[PDB]
Design a protein around this nucleic acid. Structure first.
Ligand SMILES: [Mg+2]
Ligand SMILES: [Mg+2]
Ligand SMILES: [Mg+2]
Ligand SMILES: [Mg+2]
Ligand SMILES: [Mg+2]
Ligand SMILES: [Mg+2]
Ligand SMILES: [Mg+2]
Ligand SMILES: [Mg+2]
Ligand SMILES: [Mg+2]
Ligand SMILES: [Mg+2]
Ligand SMILES: [Mg+2]
Ligand SMILES: [Mg+2]
Ligand SMILES: [Mg+2]
Ligand SMILES: [Mg+2]
Ligand SMILES: [Mg+2]
Lengths: 25, 216, 96, 206, 129, 97, 87, 121, 81
RNA sequence: AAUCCUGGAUGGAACGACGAA
RNA sequence: AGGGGAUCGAAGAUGAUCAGAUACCGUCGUAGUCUUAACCAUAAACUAUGCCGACUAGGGAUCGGGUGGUGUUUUUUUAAUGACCCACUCGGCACCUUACGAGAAAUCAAAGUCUUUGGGUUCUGGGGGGAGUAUGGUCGCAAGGCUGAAACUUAAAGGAAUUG
């Protein structure tokens, strides 16, 4: 796939993980 | 019969030129391998490898075989010839021809202590063809040829007894290794050293001496 | 000037640049992190004794078709499980 | 050295300055040419005709040195020099090649134009660059008639002239043949004028 | 910036003689350049040379023959002991028969065979062949 | 690899050129990578000029001209049978016909 | 060169360019051997009396053979004011 | 189409190269001597050859033809080649030379007439 | 050109070259002695002066500067020194 | 003897194919 | 966060096209587009070419400055100017041609002077993935940035050219 969009996917998943971890922290 | 069509071929067949050293000294261009098998009958050929090469078409692939041939008498002279042809035997034949055409001489020299009958090279030499650098370093007696098999065979057919080597690059391309080694030993006489500083009188060409028994 | 310093009092720079560019390798890294010892179900030993649990019929990878007659093995010293191969024709009938 | 009879005569100077050989190319100047004398207004250069004469005599010495004169070769693919080279070849041996050169005439031993020369002579190296190139492959010297912007690579003796002109080319070829014959001994009288005209070696549009 | 002048001098010489020029102009004329060229002259590698005295640093014009293949400089001027000499020569000379490694000693700038004879060593400068 | 040394354009010493718009597809292309043409034309045509001169008061007049400068993007210039495509050796030919 | 007791070895002592003193190799096919005829007292050329000049493919390719031959000719005497040392 | 091949063209060129003072612009007689002077297996090829010889003779009768060279032609060529005027234009008609050429002559140290004409931008 | 004498070049070339890139760098400028009308009292003046030089007896003016050589006032007489 | 002249364009839809060699 | 907010216009709404079309096309249209004060600290931020310095082939054009010329034109025929021409020069954006050279080649007057390997210095890389990921720090209002693994996985990924 396009590296730009793969990057966009990583950024979204990072955001997801950051907040679902803030749920505990 | 030969039937030369060359000033040099005519002179050779007439017997005026008896040594390839005159050819080399006057930088004469050779075009008939008959000259070389006349002057240096005592050389041996050797085929290094046959690899096939292919060209793609509407209908499959025409494969024609490449051949790398090394000729030499083991006193001071070698040649290298590469030829592609539809059949291996024709490749080898025409490659022997080309190798005889590409014959050059070698400057054997001593590692030190000029005792007897040079065994090594007089200088370090490199040769490049492609990615491949091939270096030849002088070596003492008895060391033999410290090199790969094919390069060893080239040098044995050159008459080198003891020599060291250093390569670099994709040496698994044997055509390029051998062209590099060939250049590296051709540059021996291209290198100037103090035993060659002394001036000479610039001799005259056979093409200017025996010109009457030349072309017509 | 071919990059790297050449001066006569510049050996420190060269030392440290070597160290970092050694970390770029695989052997040095594997050797100094101790992956043999912290991981790699052995302890960097050559062999290991283990306890059979089951036999397996692992299928081969393409391009090929076969069943390779492996076994699951629980090491004695670590307890770790590992799949291991039984090399020969018919030798699975000895590892019951 | 020379006996000083070969030095430039005012008759030859009249010929050269009538044919405007001295009038070289413009301030375009290849720095491999110090033959210039005092660049003119109009953006034009003047050539040292004395140096032209000396180089011409040297070229004639080299041509006379050849044992077999048929080993010398004259090239001219320019229209303005074909007649010149052919008359040169008539009054000497000088196996000529006028017009097209047929690549592979010095190499390619089976070819029908196969010459094995000891020397070649060229009107314009730019227009005849194939010939000098092939000479480089096979150990041949090259004589050329240059102007002051010409590509003198792979060029031995060069004769500065006005190759743009019709009369300059023919004049230089005529003088070359004259000197060569005087050196060979056909023309026993050095001071004599050699009854052949210079306008014989010229181009004619019909 | 301009760090070592001998290097620029010798690069100029090598490029000139690559091109086939029988002369070359050197700047800015160090003492060490003079003694280096004296060595190469004594062994016949260049010919004459002439030092031009502007009051700044000097120029040098070196007449050349085709006898010289490579004049180089070793930067940094490594310190060299009396077996390290043969190590060096084996590394950077074409043969054991000719070529001279040059090295500043306390006994002047000179070549390595002369150094063997005087039994002294020092700091390498360059090489010539 | 590098198809062109100019890379497409005429930017040597600039950094930025402040683009323009293709008059066919409104694409923002730099002024130097574009293709500038100038459509200098007579206002009417070769045909109707005779009718116009016949029906014109103020004889001898001028037939003035319409001048408009055209920029096209690469894609539109190649679609519209302009700079179309060339061989590797003739790409270097920089003069017009 | 030569071995312990005279007895020359190193076949093929080669030629050297008259303009650079670089060796001319066997495959340097742009190398040329100009031969210039001598003259004697009348204006005629002597057959078999040459002034030789070797030139290498390097010098010829770089375009300097003309000047090199000019200066060599004047150093050998067969020319006059054409070439100048001080450009 | 009616294009002819290199066999025809080369054969016709040879027949014209060495039988010009002969066959004329008429296909019939040209045919009836070409069958005699060359051996040809086919009447059709013969007639094609003869037609092209006729066309080439038609070409020759109004100017020359490239590629052709027969005895009469080359003789006329050399006869015109040796043309010379009796004035030999290099000979003097009265000479002009710029001041640069003038002091060139002076530096060479020679005796010549000079009708100096000044040339400026 | 492959042979030349860089020690004895031509004066034409050395005047053609930049003042720094000659064999021995030196100035292409010069000095003048100038007469003002009236007060003779000749005044010594540089070519590339940079200043509106003026005679001490009467402030007439001798030169006005430029990016290079100064422009001498039209009523004056200069001699090169 | 009469006699004024030219160069120039776009224009819809059309998905997919087991691997092995 | 204020201001301004005409055009265009991520979002969104619609008309069509399409097997579907929350895409291309059309019509609207918020944020943005502009500015002020303050954050961000990225880019194919590219000449994908680190800076300083020396040397090495030809050729012409051009930008800026300067020198010279009884050079041309305009002034007040005339001066000084200015604009042009010629020659030269320092410095700059570049360009053309050739390869003595280099390079895997494409190509390069630098990508040359590097196995005949060393002018000085900084930075980066070490098969491809995983992964610029996880974790931990630090900066940031945030968006995110800088720093940055391992497990596991694999024999080829890839560059340049060749003929189809
Ligand atoms: Mg390796
Ligand atoms: Mg230090
Ligand atoms: Mg940018
Ligand atoms: Mg599907
Ligand atoms: Mg599918
Ligand atoms: Mg970045
Ligand atoms: Mg980058
Ligand atoms: Mg630099
Ligand atoms: Mg300027
Ligand atoms: Mg400039
Ligand atoms: Mg600029
Ligand atoms: Mg690695
Ligand atoms: Mg990796
Ligand atoms: Mg596999
Ligand atoms: Mg590719």
């Amino acid at each position: 796939m396009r590296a730009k969009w793969r990057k966009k996917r990583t950024r979204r998943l990072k955001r997801k993980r950051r907040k679902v971890r803030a749920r505990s922290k | 019969g030969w039937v030369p069509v060359t000033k040099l071929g005519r002179l050779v067949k007439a017997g005026k030129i008896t040594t390839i050293e005159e050819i080399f000294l006057h930088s004469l261009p050779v075009k008939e391998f008959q000259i070389i098998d006349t002057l240096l009958p005592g050389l041996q050929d050797e085929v290094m490898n046959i690899k096939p090469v292919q060209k793609q078409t509407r209908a499959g692939q025409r494969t024609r075989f490449k051949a790398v041939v090394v000729v030499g008498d083991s006193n001071g002279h070698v040649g290298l010839g590469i030829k592609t042809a539809k059949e291996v035997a024709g490749a080898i034949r025409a490659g022997i021809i080309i190798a005889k055409l590409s014959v050059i001489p070698i400057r054997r020299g001593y590692w030190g202590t000029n005792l007897g009958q040079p065994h090594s090279l007089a200088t370090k030499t490199t040769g490049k063809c492609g990615s491949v650098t091939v270096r030849l370093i002088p070596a003492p007696r008895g060391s033999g040829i410290v090199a790969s098999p094919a390069v060893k065979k080239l040098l044995q057919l050159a008459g080198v007894e003891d020599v060291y080597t250093q390569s670099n690059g994709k040496t698994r391309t044997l055509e390029n290794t051998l062209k590099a080694a060939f250049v590296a030993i051709g540059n021996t006489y291209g290198f100037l050293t103090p035993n060659l500083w002394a001036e000479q009188p610039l001799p005259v060409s056979p093409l200017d001496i025996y010109s009457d028994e030349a072309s017509a | 000037g071919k990059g790297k310093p050449r001066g006569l009092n510049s050996a420190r720079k060269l030392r440290v640049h070597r160290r970092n560019n050694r970390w770029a390798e695989n052997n040095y890294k594997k050797r100094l992190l101790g992956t043999a010892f912290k991981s790699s179900p052995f302890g960097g030993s050559s062999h290991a004794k283990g306890i059979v649990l089951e036999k397996l019929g692992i299928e081969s990878k393409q391009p090929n078709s076969a069943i390779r007659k492996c076994v699951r093995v629980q090491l004695i010293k670590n307890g770790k499980k590992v799949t291991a191969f039984v090399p020969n024709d018919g030798c699975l009938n000895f590892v019951d | 050295s020379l006996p000083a009879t070969f030095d430039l005569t005012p008759e030859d100077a009249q010929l050269l300055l009538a044919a405007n050989t001295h009038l070289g190319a413009r301030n375009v100047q290849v720095h491999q040419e110090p033959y210039v004398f005092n660049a003119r207004p109009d953006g034009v250069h003047v050539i040292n005709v004395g140096k032209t004469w000396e180089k011409l005599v040297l070229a004639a010495r080299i041509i006379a040195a050849i044992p077999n004169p048929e080993d010398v070769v004259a090239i001219s693919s320019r229209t303005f020099g074909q007649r010149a080279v052919l008359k040169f070849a008539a009054h000497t041996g000088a196996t000529p090649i006028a017009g097209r050169f047929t690549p592979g005439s010095f190499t390619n031993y089976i070819t029908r134009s196969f010459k094995e020369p000891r020397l070649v002579i060229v009107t314009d190296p730019r227009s005849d660059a194939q010939a000098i190139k092939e000479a480089s492959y096979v150990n041949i010297p090259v004589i050329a008639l240059t102007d002051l912007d010409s590509p003198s690579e792979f060029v031995d003796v060069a004769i500065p002239c006005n190759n743009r002109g019709k009369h300059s080319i023919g004049l230089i070829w005529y003088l070359l043949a004259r000197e060569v014959l005087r050196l060979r001994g056909a023309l026993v009288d050095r001071t004599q004028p050699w009854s052949i005209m210079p306008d014989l070696y010229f181009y004619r549009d019909p | 910036t301009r760090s070592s002048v001998l290097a620029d001098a010798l690069n100029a010489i090598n490029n000139a003689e690559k091109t086939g020029k029988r002369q070359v102009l050197i700047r800015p004329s160090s003492k060490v350049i003079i003694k280096f060229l004296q060595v190469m002259q004594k062994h016949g590698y260049i010919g004459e040379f002439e030092y031009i005295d502007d009051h700044r640093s000097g120029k040098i014009v070196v007449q050349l023959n085709g006898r010289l293949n490579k004049c180089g400089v070793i930067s940094p001027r490594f310190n060299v002991k009396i077996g390290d000499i043969e190590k060096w020569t084996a590394n950077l000379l074409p043969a054991r028969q000719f070529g001279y490694v040059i090295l500043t000693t306390s006994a002047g700038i000179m070549d390595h065979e002369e150094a063997r004879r005087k039994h002294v060593s020092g700091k390498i400068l360059g090489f010539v062949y | 690899p590098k198809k062109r040394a100019s890379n497409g354009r005429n930017k040597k010493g600039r950094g930025h050129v402040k683009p323009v718009r293709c008059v066919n597809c409104s694409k923002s292309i730099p002024k130097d990578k574009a293709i500038k043409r100038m459509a200098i034309r007579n206002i009417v045509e070769a045909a109707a000029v005779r009718d116009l001169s016949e029906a014109s008061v103020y004889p001898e007049y001028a037939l003035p001209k319409t001048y408009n400068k055209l920029h096209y993007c690469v894609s539109c210039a190649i679609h519209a049978r302009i700079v179309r495509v060339r061989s590797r050796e003739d790409r270097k030919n920089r003069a017009p016909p | 060169m030569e071995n312990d007791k005279g007895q020359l070895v190193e076949l093929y002592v080669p030629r050297k360019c008259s303009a650079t003193n670089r060796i001319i190799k066997a495959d340097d096919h742009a190398s040329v051997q100009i031969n210039v005829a001598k003259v004697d007292e009348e204006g005629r050329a002597i057959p078999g009396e040459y002034v030789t000049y070797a030139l290498s493919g390097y010098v010829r390719s770089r375009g300097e053979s003309d000047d090199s031959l000019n200066r060599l000719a004047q150093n050998d005497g067969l020319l006059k004011n054409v070439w100048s040392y001080s450009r | 189409g009616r294009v002819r091949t290199k066999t025809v063209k080369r054969a016709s060129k040879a027949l014209i190269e060495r039988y010009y003072p002969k066959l004329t612009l008429d296909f019939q007689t040209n045919k009836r001597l070409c069958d005699e002077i060359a051996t040809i297996q086919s009447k059709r090829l013969r007639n094609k050859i003869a037609g092209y010889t006729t066309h080439l003779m038609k070409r020759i009768q109004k100017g020359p033809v490239r590629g052709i060279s027969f005895k009469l032609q080359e003789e006329e060529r050399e006869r015109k080649d040796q043309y010379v005027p009796e004035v030999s234009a290099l000979d003097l008609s009265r000479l002009n030379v710029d001041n640069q050429t003038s002091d060139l002559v002076k530096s060479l140290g020679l005796k010549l007439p000079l009708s100096v004409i000044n040339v400026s931008a | 050109v492959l042979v030349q004498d860089l020690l004895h070049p031509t004066a034409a070339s050395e005047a053609r070259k930049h003042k720094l890139k000659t064999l021995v760098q030196g100035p292409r400028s010069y000095f003048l002695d100038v007469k003002c009308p009236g007060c003779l009292n000749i005044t010594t003046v540089f070519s590339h002066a940079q200043t509106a030089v003026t005679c001490e007896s009467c402030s007439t003016i001798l030169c006005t500067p430029t990016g290079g050589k100064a422009k001498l006032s039209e009523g004056t007489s200069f001699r090169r020194k």
